Amino acid sequence: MIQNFRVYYRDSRDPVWKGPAKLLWKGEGAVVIQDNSDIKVVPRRKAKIIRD
Amino acid sequence: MIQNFRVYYRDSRDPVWKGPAKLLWKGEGAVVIQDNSDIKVVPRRKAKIIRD
Numbered sequence: 001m002i003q004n005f006r007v008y009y010r011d012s013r014d015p016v017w018k019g020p021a022k023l024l025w026k027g028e029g030a031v032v033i034q035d036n037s038d039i040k041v042v043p044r045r046k047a048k049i050i051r052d
Numbered sequence: 053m054i055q056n057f058r059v060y061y062r063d064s065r066d067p068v069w070k071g072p073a074k075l076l077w078k079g080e081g082a083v084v085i086q087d088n089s090d091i092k093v094v095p096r097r098k099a100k101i102i103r104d
Binding site for chain 2: 024025027030032039040041
């Protein structure tokens with residue numbers, strides 16, 4: 001049950017972090033999120049779980 | 053709460069279906085699954101929800 005949680009992540013075109021995203025799937029060292037209208041997979045090592 | 057469900061999917065190298073997979077995320081016309089030890093996203097139009 002994920003309440004209001006946000007996630008930041010780095011892109012492959014730039015080691016800088018990217019805007020916040022929505023946390024959907026959560027299990028091993030991987031987290032599925034959604035920034036625009038497209039869901040993608042991001043290694044947990046390149047994502048950070050922030051609270052809202 | 054996904055009980056025991058399997059999913060088949062076509063690869064981009066061949067329009068033929070691929071072995072069964074595990075159903076994890078389920079929402080819009082997209083379904084996250086896991087065949088080997090790697091989770092990926094597959095359009096619902098290229099996946100089929102089978103029961104186990």
